[PDB]
């Protein structure tokens, strides 16, 4: 019953990391919309 190892596999870790990245991007886009030319 090694759930940590499974959660550490490539698909799970990749989906979690990309989900966090997309969430950060979206959150930044609603708090700071239509960002251009810094």
């Amino acid at each position: 019953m090694n759930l940590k190892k499974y959660l550490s596999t490539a698909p799970v870790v990749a989906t979690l990391w990309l989900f966090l990245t997309a969430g950060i991007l979206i959150e930044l886009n609603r708090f700071f919309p239509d960002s251009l030319f810094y």
Binding site: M1, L3, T9, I26, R30
Partner: protein, 743 residues
């Protein structure tokens, strides 16, 4: 006599996450470590192939029963999602108040990157994406009037999904049936015929009689949805049902006294569409479900199970034998009880054919209320079921080839229909190929000839109504017979089954619901084109299944397997020789055939059926009679249909339909990206990957998992997947945008 008993193994498989951390554990080769990037693809390619994992039929049967439960749970979750979306983010009540004016919608897009524009002004207060799934019409036909019922249904669906999750886990780790179970085809058929379908239709008929009928009757009588009594009130207080239907005054006594004719208020056979909503009369639908339930229940007592009475499928199969078929159907029973691939092939072909039939019957005889008036929903449903049916048919052929390559046995298939067919497979395929050539010439050549004539100014020499005429006399004759059936061959039927055969037109909300679909020369040519494409795709699939084991080019294709790239650059070239490749080609042909079929339905419906009706009966279609003279030439099919109707999907930018336009472009990209994988080989990509790997080596950043190009078979699969995805998405966005912008 064999006892139809249940035997199961307890705690056969332990429940633990130990195997979750070892990808590829189900395969001996995949459990030794990747060593290359091809292992990642092989892990998913052979994940659901339970027959390759183990050689025991019991284990495969258990892995199927479970995972069937998982897919059932997935379907229940999807259904719960649809119901919850309807209850929380949809204008269902507003639509009920004004079904013709309010556009169905159950999706609300978040305002983040300007996507808030997709929230179309569908009406009813809320603004969102217009749904063409027919969820609103189905819910109305089911008697739903308030969103509380939708919420309760969503919760029930979630609970059912949880049950289908527990059942799937329990039937694999707590109680796994033995191979004797799953081989009781007589019992499984009896139960599915009398319990899954018979009792199911019976229960639905009861619900319609006690919920759909009264609620819909009150809705069609001008009563507000909030003022209609609750469904349980119609059951508790019989006075209400008696008032709406006097037949209920007699109660169930007439049923038990065989005085079924007293149920003429609830069990009618009017035959036509309701003039108020445009759909089938709910009474005729309830009577239909009752008859189908009684017929299925009677049919469910045919096979013999744990009692002397019944029938044996093996005895019936072996009994059918003739001079032209030596052993007849001998050995087929053992084939369908020892190989899941054969059963899957038969079931997939039948399920796909059933879906196609469903599409035709649903558009011609709109069953749900206000379904015909909602052309977007009609187009989407016909096209959707047509596509799912075609995909299931191609899958049926693929699984037939799989069984032929892996589960075939010469002893079992000895002098029987299957063996006798494999013996003369050359006659079958050459004659079928000849039929395909004849059909293509006499179908596409007519179109090409018309193009050449119109371009030369020789319109008098065309295959049209004005010029040489090719009238579907047989189909037109069947239509006339159907038109006259309600009085000479259907004595108790009060109207034709479908107004598409004849009779009169039906208009609901100043919109045409169903009018006679007259067939002409254009329909003659298009129908022949459909037959030609169906013949070529079935030829490809049949060829792949008949030669799956061997051929005059490769004498031992079976030993090579069902899914192998090729035998090499020998014998002139043996590329795409395996049955899997035949399925790969059949996918493109099925896509072509289905695309042409949906194109004909869309254009014909928008030019001769769908449209508006002005006071006094004047009819004005979306494309006034242009299909009669424009569908007879390829130029017309490109100008009056692909170019004229695409203006809605290309000009959708800046409005709520912009998304569709975007998807219209994206799909194209995908369809064009597939070409990359279809016109190329892995040798070149492997060399390019070698150079890229050298670049990585120069920086000490090379990966342990040696990068490799996609396998030949994997490359073909990716190419076909992208091709179908892009094409179907392009025609999906085009159909939806065209039908939503106008009509």
């Amino acid at each position: 006599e064999k006892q139809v008993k249940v035997v199961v193994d307890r705690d056969v498989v332990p429940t633990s996450f130990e195997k979750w951390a070892k990808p590829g554990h189900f395969s001996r080769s995949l459990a030794k470590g990747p060593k290359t990037t091809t292992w990642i693809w092989n892990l998913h390619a052979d994940a659901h192939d339970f027959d390759s994992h183990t050689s025991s039929l019991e284990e495969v049967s258990r892995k199927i029963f479970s995972a069937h439960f998982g897919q059932l749970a997935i379907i229940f979750i999807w259904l719960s999602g649809m119901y919850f979306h309807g209850a929380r983010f949809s204008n269902y009540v507003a639509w009920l108040s004004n079904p013709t004016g309010i556009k169905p919608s159950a999706q609300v897009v978040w305002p983040i990157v300007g996507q808030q524009i997709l929230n179309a002004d569908v009406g009813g207060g809320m603004q969102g994406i217009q749904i063409t799934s027919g969820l609103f019409q189905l819910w109305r036909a089911s008697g739903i009037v308030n969103e509380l019922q939708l919420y309760v249904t969503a919760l029930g669906g979630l609970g059912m999904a949880g049950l289908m999750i527990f059942a799937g886990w329990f039937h694999y780790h707590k109680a796994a049936p033995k191979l004797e179970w799953f081989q009781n085809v007589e019992s499984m058929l009896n139960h599915h015929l009398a319990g899954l379908l018979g009792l199911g239709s019976l229960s639905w008929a009861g619900h319609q009689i006690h919920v759909s009928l009264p609620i819909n009757k009150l809705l069609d009588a001008g009563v507000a949805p909030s003022s209609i009594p609750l469904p349980h009130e119609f059951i508790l207080n019989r006075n209400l049902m008696a008032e709406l239907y006097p037949s209920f005054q007699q109660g169930l006594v007439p049923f038990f006294t065989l005085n079924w004719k007293q149920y003429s208020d609830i069990l009618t056979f009017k035959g036509g569409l309701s003039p108020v909503t445009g759909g089938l009369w709910l009474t005729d639908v309830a009577h239909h479900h009752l008859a189908i339930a009684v017929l299925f229940l009677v049919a469910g007592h045919m096979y013999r199970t744990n009692w002397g009475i019944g029938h044996s499928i093996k005895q019936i199969l072996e009994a059918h034998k003739g001079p032209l078929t030596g052993e007849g159907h001998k050995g087929l029973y053992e084939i369908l009880t020892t190989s899941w691939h054969a059963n899957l092939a038969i079931n997939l072909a039948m399920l796909g054919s059933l879906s196609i039939i469903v599409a035709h019957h649903m558009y011609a005889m709109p069953p749900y209320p206000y379904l015909a008036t909602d052309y977007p929903t009609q187009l989407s449903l016909f096209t959707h079921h047509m596509w799912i049916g075609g995909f299931c048919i191609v899958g049926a052929g693929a699984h037939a080839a799989i069984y032929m390559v892996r589960d075939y046995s010469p002893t079992v298939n000895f002098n029987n229909v299957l063996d006798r067919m494999i013996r003369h497979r050359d006659a079958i395929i050459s004659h079928l190929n000849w039929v395909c050539i004849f059909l293509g010439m006499h179908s596409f050549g007519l179109y090409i000839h018309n193009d050449t004539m119109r371009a030369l100014g020789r319109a008098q020499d065309m295959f049209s109504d004005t010029a040489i005429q090719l009238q579907p006399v047989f189909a037109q004759w069947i239509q006339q017979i159907h038109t006259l059936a309600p009085g000479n061959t259907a004595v108790n039927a009060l109207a034709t089954a479908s107004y598409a055969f004849g009779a009169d037109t039906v208009t609901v909300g100043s919109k045409i619901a169903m009018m006679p679909i007259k067939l002409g020369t254009a329909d003659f040519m298009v129908h022949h084109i459909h037959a030609f494409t169906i013949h070529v795709t079935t030829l490809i699939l049949l060829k792949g299944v008949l030669y799956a084991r061997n051929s005059r080019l490769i004498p031992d294709k079976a030993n090579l397997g069902f899914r192998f790239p090729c035998d090499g650059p020998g014998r002139g070239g043996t590329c795409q020789v395996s049955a899997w490749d035949h399925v790969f080609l059949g996918l493109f042909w099925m896509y072509n055939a289905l695309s042409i079929v949906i194109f004909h339905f869309s254009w014909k419906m928008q030019s001769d059926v769908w449209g508006t009706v002005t006071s006094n009966g004047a009819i004005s279609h979306i494309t006034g009679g242009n299909f009669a003279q424009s569908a007879i030439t390829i130029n017309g099919w490109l100008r009056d249909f692909l170019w004229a109707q695409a203006s809605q999907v290309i000009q959708s930018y800046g409005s709520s339909l912009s998304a569709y336009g975007l998807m219209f472009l994206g799909a194209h990209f995908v369809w064009a990206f597939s070409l990359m994988f279809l016109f190329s080989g892995r040798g070149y990509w492997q060399e390019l990957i070698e150079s890229i790997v050298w670049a990585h080596n120069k920086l000490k950043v090379a990966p342990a998992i040696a990068p490799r190009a996609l396998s030949i078979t994997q490359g073909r699969a990716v190419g076909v997947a992208h091709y179908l995805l892009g094409g179907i998405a392009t025609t999906w966005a085009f159909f939806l945008a065209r039908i939503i912008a106008v009509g």
